[PDB]
């Protein structure tokens, strides 16, 4: 089960617990006004279905375990591939629209509804780990800087960036790090 006690997570964040319609009675989601969400499938999540509510604290039952958790600030920040940029609000306002590099024409980063999963100071990104050659076009050797994961896959916030991950300046992507909590939204649209 994630998250884990007292967590201070962000609004995008799933409920992760670890016949599917069984077990996904056994779990219940208690909020102040009763959010909603939908199932997503081993190891299915519980979702809110429009982000949850600030401040909120969340409570979840499953079996004859109940764990609970916290949410910060609303942070928001949204990648348009159109516009080529990484726009952050917090709670309503925009507080820094940064330009920012979303993949490349091959592999541009791909549209959808996230969140900050780990923030990683530096992270050495090495593409032979998974079968791509270093002289490939997609091939690469990289120490990442403020690395701010997006999805299981791969992508990440940290120019003909590969795997679709999205590349800010050294000044912008410090601020994005020094800002963001896990859970904090990712949306990526035109």
């Given at each position: 089960v994630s998250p884990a006690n007292g967590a201070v997570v962000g609004v995008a964040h799933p409920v992760v617990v670890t016949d599917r319609r069984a077990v996904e009675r056994s779990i219940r989601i208690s909020t102040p006004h009763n959010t909603t969400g939908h199932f997503?499938?081993?190891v299915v999540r519980w979702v809110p279905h429009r982000y949850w509510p600030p401040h909120t604290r969340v409570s979840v039952g499953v079996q004859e375990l109940t764990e609970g958790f916290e949410t910060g600030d609303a942070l928001i920040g949204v990648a348009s591939i159109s516009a080529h940029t990484f726009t952050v609000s917090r709670n309503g306002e925009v507080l820094r629209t940064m330009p920012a590099s979303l993949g490349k024409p091959s592999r541009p980063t791909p549209i959808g509804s996230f969140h900050a999963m780990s923030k990683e100071r530096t992270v050495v990104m090495d593409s032979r780990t998974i079968g791509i050659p270093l002289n490939s076009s997609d091939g690469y050797l990289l120490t990442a800087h403020y690395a701010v994961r997006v999805t299981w896959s791969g992508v990440y916030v940290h120019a003909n960036v590969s795997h679709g991950?999205?590349?800010?300046?050294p000044d912008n992507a410090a601020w994005y790090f020094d800002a963001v909590t896990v859970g904090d939204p990712i949306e990526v649209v035109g």
């Open positions: 997503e499938w081993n991950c999205i590349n800010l300046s």
